[model samples]
Target chain A: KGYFGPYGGQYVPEILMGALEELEAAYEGIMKDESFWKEFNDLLRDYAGRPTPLYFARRLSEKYGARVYLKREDLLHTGAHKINNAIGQVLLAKLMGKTRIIAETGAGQHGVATATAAALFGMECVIYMGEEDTIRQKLNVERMKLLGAKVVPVAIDEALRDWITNLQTTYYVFGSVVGPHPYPIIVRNFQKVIGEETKKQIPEKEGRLPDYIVACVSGGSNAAGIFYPFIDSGVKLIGVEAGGEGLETGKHAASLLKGKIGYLHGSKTFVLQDDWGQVQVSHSVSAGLDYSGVGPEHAYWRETGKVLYDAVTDEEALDAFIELSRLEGIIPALESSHALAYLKKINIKGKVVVVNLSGRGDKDLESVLNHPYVRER
Target chain B: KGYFGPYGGQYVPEILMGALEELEAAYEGIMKDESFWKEFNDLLRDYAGRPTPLYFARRLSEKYGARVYLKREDLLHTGAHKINNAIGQVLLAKLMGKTRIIAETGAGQHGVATATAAALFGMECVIYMGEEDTIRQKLNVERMKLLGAKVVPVKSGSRTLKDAIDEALRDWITNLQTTYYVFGSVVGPHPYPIIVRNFQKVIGEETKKQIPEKEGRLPDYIVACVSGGSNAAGIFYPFIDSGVKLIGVEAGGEGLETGKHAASLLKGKIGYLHGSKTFVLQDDWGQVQVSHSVSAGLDYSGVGPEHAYWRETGKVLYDAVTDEEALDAFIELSRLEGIIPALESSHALAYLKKINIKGKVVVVNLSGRGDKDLESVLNHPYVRERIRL
Candidate 1:
């Protein structure tokens, strides 16, 4: 019944149907509860350090010819925007009488975030990460272990299998806005704090709303979070997708750009697929953006022309990453660099622009230093 | 002339006397100027993200039977309390018409902070780090490089923090007209200890206001880790006359029983080191001993002069926690509070377990994040054995 203009719906197995409905019901009730939100906001403020500084990038502005402001989600406890959704979903699960939490992660930012919250709430946490990802993001695996999470190296299928079996005791903490109907809605609402804070921050810093909002899109949670609040306010929104090498090279994760109509991970979305309808492997230097599909809400947004989606090459992102680090002394994540990279592509000479710095780059130092651009430099 | 009781003074080379006096005079003037402080505070607020949350550690409090609040300096930009002093010194340097900034660092937290402030102000920065620390803290070296600071590896004497300070002092003496030595802590000669302490006092000032609002009164105890003692000096200064018990935790390394420890205030006699007459970890002949700590930040042979004075006046109780205890506390906080604290701050957290703080309001200054220590922590035998990683 949940559809985002025929883009998002509950396309799952029969065994999973009841669990999704239960989650939706629980979420629906919590959405109306003021006390639940108050507790969440309190945790956000004191625990996770919210209302993060909307920093004016003075040097970056001079260089870019625009009044650039960074929505500093990077300053959050886990050094990422993922925690907003992780904390929200974990709270929701606790209210649903769930005792344990299970989550799947690619780059492991979400796993670490989930494990942190689970530890805070004293909930048992089991994080299922793809074997390749567990190896690639080994530090995060140790971080999860330190936070008392049992990390299982397996694919999403294993996570789904575990979820189906442990439905009564376990709540699946969806990492992004990709999964089923309620997940997109739930994650967006949790992360909307980013845009909501920015909306108030920009007007207080500047005199009015920004001319544009830019954020990188992987599963599109960060983009959805920052874009939703500014949709009807005449503020242009841009979702930058990871153009790993190049689109023509067929080595990119630009699902919203090069992808066609398809269903992936439950929802109907523009997915990276081949002629045989098999999902093609995606590529991005940023492990977080290496995805074959995007969130379905983004697909609907694309279809309706509500938000503009573009692609930035890995080299461009890498350049932007170093530029920001040297110029502002802020090393940005490769994923967030995609959004910063888009600033150079567009001409906003005198306009004010807000870039969602979704995470800090401390995690990606090795990946960034290993890249040819930085290595050569 | 700048002596805390019989502690701090201008114990330095004759050639450096004028430079120190000039710096002291300029610092004295800047301290009185309201506009200069306003600009510095503004930078701290907008750029460094100040007023870091005074989070009430719920789970931690439940286990300890105390109302434990953490002064979250770890959430600050550059991931430490070092930025407070770094920004202040760099701003002072800018006002003094100094074109270059120099600093010595052990764990490189101070180096990173100085480099960050230097980048913000578009000033040339050169960081002197011990050759050993350059290897121990390689990531910070890369971070400083990324921030466009030239990091010179000092390899003299013990090739640690003190050695780096010697090299930095030498550089400043040679380039006196153009260089400003941004001393990282409340330990250096003359105005540096006072300058760094005043900049860091914001931690205590903020905590004083926050605790009164949150807990209806002042805290019963304020615990902070003491290496160069800037963090402790910061949070302790405001509460000195308020009847609140203050505890300064030092790195016991293996233990205070062992000769290999960095508990300067707890175990050593007052002597001169790093241009300040403070507690020195030295041998029978007054030769400084090699200090060991699992935390590079706390592995120093000297204590700050103000810390020495506090110890003498009985204003703050000095204590030490062993490497194993700190490592355990580091893990406990990460697991219990989801806050991975710096190994330096872990000492303060460890003190909580040893002391009877039941039903009392206690505040621990979490000076920095532990992201920089993950590699060394994972490699530790204690951590490996406990976590079985």
Candidate 2:
């Protein structure tokens, strides 16, 4: 609210300023659209499978003597909480008279969610990915195709060469909040429903704000949503970022942990940057968490002192990942597994806790089984 | 009550005779358990995603000049109709105080469904599959593991589902005391066909209620695809005695004209496998052979004994589904209505198209989605090259 605490501003060219202005106004219109909300609520309840349960981890909690709970978004349709954001954006696109939708994804979970929404609405979809990501995530590429999304592998050199090379008539729906003005705020606003729902659900069940409500912070949509409503509500909210190997190895995706103040993509926020202000490469075992830039809303929250950000090494996260599956009988997504790692370190007494298991482990299946990275220890 | 009209019997080896006798008495004990149907009805209503909407496929029907309403089991959790049987079986397993659940799957959909049920019930689950099926369906194996079920890949026979079911029979023999064999579909012998239908009859029960609300009467016809025919049987069971026209669609692999098909109901001799006499594609020696079908669920070389009984007794009209006709329905529904159907369910759609079923509210079972059939659909020559606006 305090201007991303003076770290954020509009950064688009004059040529696109008018379009940006129109978008802000149009989004305002959509917010007031009663019928849109009705349809969205209905689908959330019916299709994408919302009111995701607040399930108690009987076995895991018993082992440590600390009661733990999870908002099971992993059970949602298309198998992730990503669909919460995707559904809102697609409905917005439909209302805007945009006949098409486009998006970018790293592991293609976002791409799959976008494609499913597009397919259901009968809209043409074009998804962009790093050429390398497309190859490594071939199975997801096939999923997008099956869901009716046309794949456009954006080679590194060409994307850097010109933005027009990536341009099309379709509305480009950025998967993260790293882009231009209003996106970070608006995306967080949409995700706030997670917090809103949990606020009612937790207290009704546990009779209090969680002692520590933890979630994996990547693009920060999941974290931002689960954290936003509890900003003023007296509660401990923690975000766990991906520490690829050890942060000391200089290969982590922890933007807040190791980043500098800089401008990258379309905004000024915490980013992995070199001495020259150019963006630096980041790495993580979990595709969703391997991001260089923090969501601007998260950046705003950090400066305003509304939340706490922390790091969990990949090895530590993997241990907790397998524990939840075998002991508690919940195979958390690798990203959610990181949050489990952070919870492991935080010493808690007899206090309530809710972990946002933001995604299901279905997409992470192949990697959990065959990937050399996951440690048996 | 009819007990598969004599085709179904408790045919088993001496070692398994006591187990079947115990199962029969235990089933009878639970069938009239007042709380059991109440709980089953509640789960079917609340959990497991039931009363799936009978969506009117207006555009697809218009394009083909047929009146088609899709029975949308494809909307259910795990994205197939198999959950109906799993939900019932798991509950019964829990009721029996059985600590473990075991199942066999071919295309892996049934394994996923069974695994999901086990996870929900918080029971130990084991899924057996052939080595050949496991390698190809590694994703499903991973899915089962994620669901906290032990997946054992059996290296035997042709290394496919048939072999896996054979192994499941072996597992059932050894573990019958502590485990429940949650049959994936309407296969197996005796009580399985009758009990599985009772579990899945919610589809038909709900259909009976919903159709009247939507159309002011029951549908003119009920159409469903046949593998072991659980889904079709469930949807048609309530309407069977009510005199609605019933259509059972079997996979025509290439085409029935070519004789290379899984159209067991249309072109099968009586034979036995997995303990029940049924219509099967067999040689003079009566050995089950490989079947060819675009859809894995429909690639079984036999129809269930109950299906055979229904067909022979003139309770249903059994038809054939060509690979071409089914794929045509798949694409037509996707582009026109934006609903991507499971290729298996499209077998039923083929019948609607074949009859040029105009002005009839023919409810075709949209059993599952095409998400699992990505590789199969995309690699098909016609889909890869011939799909056009």
Candidate 3:
């Protein structure tokens, strides 16, 4: 089990425990393999379009009364930061001699990235998504099909049942940092390249480290990726949550802000639950952030009071989405818009800020258009 | 008048000729200025994501018994090659002191690109699109609006690209002092074709360096789909003397025998259109016939004059890809390479299946992304019928 301060230990069924241990050992050996790292970095540079630009958001900075630089993960292949973890996990699957890949998704971004890696590695892939999600994200379904992945429209728990049943020949590619012991660590290590690149890139551009590093937190993979490196740099680490309506309305998904340290999703994290200890359902305009539990690393940070967690309402995020688009000609994903929205509530005049732009808005177009905010006429 | 070997001349109205000449002279001076080129190249690199990857399609190449590389222009900003010209033209318009940008679009890619550039430069932008196209490409209209542009829907004479262009030209004529007409493709008169092609030449320039480094020699073939011929011209012009087989695919629509297609180079006659002498799809009475293609971009009645010249000199071979073949290739490439290509690019990919390349290297210029064609592909008969090889 990979523990961070009092969180993050393997809490799984007896049948799946052995496989998790095997994964932990296999990845530990591969982590130090120089050739393995060389292959991952090659995919990152040439295939995933890494060393993603550190663009100065001049117009946005002028409006915010601060110098704001965006780490452009949106420019990555597959148009998001998900591909980084996807590529790393898929390469690990290859090293482990796994011939098949399985994943579960809500928005299908991770699904597409997994399918892409599967196609590249010539492995069989099956993406488990809810039936409603298939219709809501039809284009992503087609995208997955195009990348040679069979999309299975079933409940996520049912998909986990299949994974447990087919563990002999299948590899479960966990998406974020909320899963069992090694998964959270593996995802963070893979995603830490974002911070690692930013650490090297920002100082070269700005001559010093930033005053603040901010990212939107759902599972906190992106947040952990950026914040993990700057922990000792004296930079203020901020993780913004999707304040769907407001924290008061009981309609938000601010897990770190309102939830308690409870054991959920194979880790001790801040999970939204009721008095009866049942996991409470959550909501957010951004599909990626509508989660009940977050990564255990974030839980550790919250317990130690080392990181500040904030929330932005859906209306505020939507406004920021349009503002960024009109001001900088950059349409950001709604998940990223939360971080942009939080800028308005802070006092950061002349403070250098690095915002992790998690992804592009192409996937959110239909939802955005269907919303009452956008003027179609 | 300007001509590229009995092609691409100023055959416009008398009033527009003076503006064309002025544009030609201004651009000629700017082309030699290192500072101007530097600014354009910087934007191409940082903003539009240029020097886009020359990705080797491993699975597709193995299946076809050839070495296939794709020039990934689809990864460019706004998901296409249109932004290259947009950035170049918007910068030149700023240098010329024009405060407003106007463009005409059918499928709205150029309109969105222009709007993006205008937003970047803080200039006023107006996009004239056909009324039907406003509905057909509503997402692009929304995109332009988000980029801070005003979209005017033109409703006249079948309400297509021709009508939209007329409305845009009238707008330009009325606001000539403040507005610049940003032509989308290489079919325009005088310096427009040269300017558009020059802006896009980075594709071929990069390929020239990449192919030699990767394959130890120049490619055996270079293929691209021809719409207004800017992307094709940009890639082909740099390799004109390199002995590479340059192939241009046009939309075959239903079929060649059905007589409803956009086979401008293969079936069209030389005629003056949109202010240039180019191969045109015209009827016996000299009226331009309507074109039919699954791709909105390649639904055209005219070919660029330089492409006509290349065809005449036997330096370029013209081919046609039927709608079904292009659709099938689009799906196959999406599955095999994990990159969903524009339907126009699918024509070139489909042609690769029929060619006998054995072990020779080939480069395919993928001009755009395919999110714009998702609805069309979902409705396509072949995909709807669940046809498989």
Candidate 4:
């Protein structure tokens, strides 16, 4: 719960230590509680619709000359893998006797997921987004509101401060694998269902482990989720990052690939930092992947050479998005498109590959439609 | 294959008889083949994600004092029960070795669905839509285009679904050998109603198995909105002998007294229209009345023959939900249950508010999701009124 080889640790405003420790302790206790797990798994199966099909991509396999299977987290209730962690964390919050939940979101994916969990569990939820983000992502704002969450349109940093200040009653739900100690670990554990299910589903479907497991790494939640269970299985793990324009152009979010080890969101990790070590802005066609810092665990993996990280440019991702739509009739989230784009780069002719299609693309309609490639097509 | 209790029969142009008979014969052969059923079921399960969860509506149940459940067809691949029929018919089309598919649609929901199925099967597809509809629903027009279907806007009398259907029929006659007309509803002639209903009855089958499993008995009521009446017929058919009260809610645009509603079952006498002896919304001289409703699916001048028969025998209770009433249900369900229903499905939900229902379990067939309706909802007068107040 502390560090992945000096990559992760708790460093925060001192006032938040007790809250973090308490959450860590609660999560640890639930980790071993069989009944707690049973309840969690039941909710996942019945409510959130778990055991999402490990769909065999026949057309993709035909195109790539590889046995390709999609780990369909896109079929989940909220249409993304984010719901896995959101639902798990909300249940943990309920167990901790917290009636109120607060989360800060950039583009409202996590906010909508958090609010969905809150609505299902009948809890009070507040989502903090940048004042400008609320307008730009108005559809998501409406979704959060529809799910009975109050949208706080103040600055996100201030909202996090307010959440910590009211630590006694409010539970601050972290979205990805970037926050303090236990958060990165807890988020991965919650999301590990993807890999764990894949470990079983792949063997059942293909009668063996995949030759390669590919996933997009945006703050590394989806990658961490699918890669963790296979790290010791000798299966090759590939993490595709968003190379916005080009990795050489200094506009991309390939923090682990090009940036040095630094701290941004409470833990030592790869980050896009300037000379004074302040975080630099990152860019991606996908709002989810445009993060300055990556998950600390990914930083550990990068150093240990346990996983290979690659970058997919916006052009490649857009091309994959359009091709996948034309071929499979499945519109993927821009974040997931990065992983799909990387598939065309592999040289393996007939090896078995698994791609964690982490989300659907209904939310990215306007953006995708406005893209020159899609519009012209 | 051409008649349903003296309602459905071939009344098309003489040139279309051979095409219709060929389709009927091909459908009959596939219907008898076990392998064909397997292929259909596999596509339904793997591709369309069938057996969509029968959600227990806890909040709505408590609010209405009745145990309520929703048969969530809203979660289907294309966000509607329309896909159930589309996928099935397309499979049948593929079986018949058809290379092209054509459909006539008013609001483009059916058009988008037809295009989706066509795209999936890799078939050339064309959609005939009213010129007015192409303007009203540009989003759907774009969606169909995105799926690679050609959209033809038919400008004729009233310039609506009827005109589009007329044009589509003419096109089908010319290309009958290589093309299949994918009818969107149960009102279509002959084997279409049976084919569509058979495909959609899986909803009722699931509901039957689920209601007893969840509640230890059959539900006291089954509710569904009547559009082209396929969704209602599909669900109602299985439970006809279950003694459960079947309620059919129609789109009452303003109200029955206003005479602008699409309550064809309640007002229209049995008559021949669109190749069927069924309830048609008509005036004194039997000219089809232009129907009005917020739901594009329900903006019809006629209803399916089975629904007319059900209404005649008192096997189903017919009622109307007005535009404003349906809109309120649309908002209420979206806010309360976190599920936005299609405006057509909202009609069934709206009727729940009027009846004094409690204790007994009720299952409402949620036919489609409301993601496509979000724009209209955001622009609704109700929203404007709220902002003003």
Candidate 5:
């Protein structure tokens, strides 16, 4: 019943089935509720700052030979589009009478976003992060603590155990669209505002739809959110994946480029796995895009040829990161920089292009500065 | 030509007088031109993300017994209200045929803001920062450099903001033919104070319209922190005639009695500093005294001329909050509202405790975000002891 072209289904432990089904039922009910949507829209507009400006990158347009428009989700509160889904799910948790919210994060962007919403709603938030990540992203960890969230350092197994153990009092706030059944659908629906706004905004500004839409895909929520509205519009959709070093090096996160069908994080998708179907460790300069599997919807779209999937190396992404900073004075997140890097690979002279700038690069200052290229310069 | 009730004038060297007059005439002409304003407003709206949200602080309001709203200028492009003036002045410089932009920064907020505008306009930009500030606020130094601005570290006399200003002024005197000095706040000589206030008034104009729509009437009180007072002037000027109670909070570093505060309006006598005749923290010999604050932005020897005028006229009340109180407010706001305020803005929030505003609708100008102050806040003994980090 939850299949997205045979790629998505409820493949979780039996102990978690009831909670997933309950979430799915509630999600379905809320999807049709007009008042819920009204409340969601109000929060997005007033609190998170929705309809984020679709800024024309004049200098970048001149340099790249295209009419480049940036979907400025980077301007959103918390400096990313992750808040859109976080707010939606947090609201759902509140509606379900869940008093405590549990979430797992690697780099802490989603954790911070979820913690922010939890604070606003006065819910008890406990963020489970890897002990390694807690130290690496200490600033964001402190930020979550400042927002009154209890940060617990643990692995994925412990996080899931906590979710299963405390199913009645707690709700798991999934960060992306990678998890089973209703989560992919829920996150996509919440994040669809990006594409939906771009659809109306581009027409008002350019008198037509954009020729191509580019977005970076990891768990693929950002790309799916911006790509879904244009799926049937005859506009080209391109999802840029992180090629950590190169696909040849077997160190990349380009799941659709060189991957096999497998189940990961409760969904069957193109995954980076070895011969015995063991998930391989993925790498990328962007902490967000360093994933082994993508969203099931992306797997479906890739197989059906509905969207083009491509990869850009870390170096290319880094180049675009600095280039965009210098040209537009907008330092883009490295995840978003992959999409910008793809512009150089394609000929888009005089064409209309919209790049989903999913986040800002203030978080990546240390990573960018320490890169070999920057260090040498 | 520019006097704010005997507080502001062109008290500069003779060599800079002709340039000052030129700037005055240009500013006057630009202020009247419709197209100039239209362009300026468009840049503010689109590029700088204007009409920043007037967010109702639900939890904060419930706790304080007063309806509280925050003007979220922290959400602006460079993370502060500084961009508002930077863009306006840069556009003016472009129209004035100046191809070079120069600014002096205390904590590098203004430097980053000016560098952003200069990068956008393709101008030769230079930022003069104190050698001490350059080390303390090195991230902002890197940011300005990334935006293609040359940052010069001044090591003269105390090696601080005043020294940086001296170097920038010297640079402007030598390069006046092609350089335009984008003053950071509403504390410079006559035309600059007037020009900055005009640009920043958009904050008040937007708030004026927003509050009426949301609350169906004017707010009873409007509170803002004053360093050089551009943010306070911005939010206070529009409400001056509306019978609204305006409060300006200054830095009470240790305390007013300890002689370590930056509460110029509340504690100091009339004197000149930064080429402006205003309330200055001075010694008996008329030399400017060193000011102290936990907030780098508000540790200033003098305040804006307009703030002095308003104090004299009793149009606005001036108050001070100690560093410990400000730190408490900073943590309180973060835990309560999930919004980390700049320490400068936290002073205004701290003043809410001192005043009795029960059941009153109050709007606090959240002038900037506190990401820049995380290091300092975390290092404070009060914050360290309370948060236990």
Candidate 6:
């Protein structure tokens, strides 16, 4: 039902096309299904823990001279808000009678969450990752292994091993809206609860709608998760994309801000492409957002102009990353730092600002230690 | 009110004796303080997401021929069962009017968790680490740093977590007025062991409701990991009187076989460690020896005093597992139940396979998340892998 002026549409392969169409149709049915909605809300309330506190970052607000509220997604089980969508999607996958689930993760947040859902439903799970990533993100691999998932580290350069191993009954769960058709739509739809929860949480806590809702967008799912329900509520939704080494160096993942149209990970979305036009993967202090391709839903939003997207360079994100640390003593995920950095650049005055703290920083502890701190190692 | 039958007593420095007395007095005052309970339970319910589930793992149970349920502390926020203690201890630290906080961590779970609380409470936080640990656990150091904690890697003596504990004690001695030492596990001086046990008791408190509601009655057996026995005790405390046939699993590592494991309960004898006279895997000279396990959480050579006392009393049985067995169970539970357990909890699962558990209902403490162990699992080539930019 929500659209970014049709920039988000289903363009897929013929075989997978049927799956998308069926999902889109089933999603519409399940979106309003009485039984489905009841169970969904129950799990959200009881199991997944929805309506997380919209905490007043009083210290953070005083420092910025703006009323700042943090959407406490960090407090959720598994330490991130994305689990909300992952649980919903996997439950829907179960509803559709899917036998197995496939997903990809950089930081392994989504993969872990999806594996959790599969375990709950007794379904099988497969996760694809760049082989190089496996070594870098070893802790997440252990987590997936603990959750009983088959982690397949694939060379993104080529797809081999029958090019068609069990694709028929497996549901490929993409991390963001940047995948093929229906996914961008489906992921966004599941994520809209973030906005809806915020809509209720903000007014209840502050007595008014927030002036701005800020979120870091990797594939933009977390942003879409919070910003979707508020698009018509007159609150300004700002997406902060990571400009890893500054946009000009072309090492950033600020796809919509810096790159042109490119295709990677099966969708035509804006990505960090080179002069000769090969997509360049991004690197950030935060592992979650270091990606080459972004969610297609984000690309769709960039074109329609409902809200705005800005690029937060790696240095700037690190600054805000440290600033939040030094000021409020809250160490946000490096990915979340991209959005928190926006507060320093822009002044919100008397309006309330809400930021989604998508994940915790335990996974990024090494980056924090290695950071140049005077008089410290 | 809950005693370790005699093994646990107030053990503190001469200067801390008065502070410990006040702590016990104030804690008893606040435990009875209705307002404090309201705030504590409010956060327990709303903030840290307590009253964790006691889910029936029918599939896991059927495989073992015993009905199995899991007390899910792993599902708690901050990814480990450690948060239960952190939330309670941090609040206690706040209540005690300690303006600054410090703690020790190995593998960084406890440190990151302690730092997280310090951030939330607006307290100045510092974490002590062995210099060698600071290098090996580089990511944990970074995590605590990002959380606004100052990581001081101790360069002196053996340079492991135990030495870090010594460094922390020195820090406490120097900064007594301003700092509170938030010990990570339940193996410390008096009120901490007692109080932390109370805070985590919600694991058992919740299990009372979650069980029977899923199954027809209480379980026949209970299993939980015993790093310091805090999490295991938390889940098993309420059921101790239930005659639930409790089992405590220690990290078997290369096996208690070559004197290379952390099976403190099984292989260790009663001795003093970390200021408590309890079971410790010590050498003939009484020096704590090297303890190894794939589970960083259970690499400690001493069991919590309460667990030691429980073992002496014969109320609970002890079990063990090797690193290879724990790793296999770690992967098995994940793939089978989709529950990726902490390496500490995984050790319990490995030992769980050995019991003649037919027709018995078993519940294990699913403590902590397995996020820290991803590398060890994928190091093997059995799983599919891809490589690219």
Q: lDDT per prediction?
A: 0.90, 0.76, 0.86, 0.83, 0.89, 0.75
lDDT of 1 by residue, B1-389 (tens): 68888899978878888988898889888767999998888777767778788999999999999999999999888899999999999988898899999999999999999998998888999999989889978889988988889999998987888889889988998899899999998987897899899999999999988887898988899999997899999999999978999999999999898998899998888788878888999889888888989998998989999999898999999999999999988989999988899999999999998888999999999999998888889899887797654
Which numbered prediction scores highest in DockQ against the true structure? Answer: 1
> What DockQ does model 1 achieve?
0.71
- Residue A208 error, candidate 1, Å: 1.4
- Expressed as tens digits, the lDDT of each residue in B10-67 for candidate 3 is 8877988678877888899996899999989977876777778888888889989999
**A258-377 per-residue lDDT for model 6 (tens digits):** 877776655777767878898776776677887777787677666776768997877777777777776655667888988999998788877799999887665665665566642253
Worst 10 residues of 1 chain B by lDDT: B380-389
CAPRI band for model 2: incorrect
What local lDDT does model 6 show for residue A237? 84
Q: In candidate 5, what are the lDDT values of residues B1-389, reduced to their tens digit?
A: 68888899978888888988898999888767999999888778767777788988889999999999999888888888999999999999999999999998887889999998988888999999988778878788888888889999999875666678889999998998999999999987879998999999999999999998889999999999997999999999988868999999999999999998899898888988878999998889888888888887887778999999999999999999999999999988888877888989999999889888899999999999887788789888888888664
Error of 2 at B366 (Å): 3.7
Tens-place lDDT digits, model 6, residues B165-203 = 888988887887888888888887777788778878888
Error of 4 at B230 (Å): 2.5
Deviation from native of the Cα of residue A17 in model 5, angstroms? 1.2
What's the CA error at residue B266 for candidate 4, in Å?
A: 2.2
Give one digit per residue, the lDDT tens place, for model 2 in B172-233: 88987888898877877767888888888888887888777657877778888997888888
Q: What's the interface RMS deviation of candidate 4?
A: 2.0
Tens digit per residue, CA lDDT, model 4, A1-377: 48999888887778778888899899989988888778778767655657777877778889889888888888777788888888889889989998888898997889888888877777888899988889899888987876778998975577668777777768888889988898999899989999999998888877888999999997999999999999868899999999999999989999888777787767888889778877889999899898888999998897899999999999899988776666776778899999999998987588999999998777776787898866786
Clash-forming residue pairs, model 2: none
Angstrom error of the Cα, residue B323, model 1: value is 0.8
Docking class of 3: medium
What does each candidate score in C-alpha RMSD? 1.5, 4.0, 2.1, 2.3, 1.5, 4.9
DockQ of 6: 0.36
Residue A341 lDDT (model 3): 89
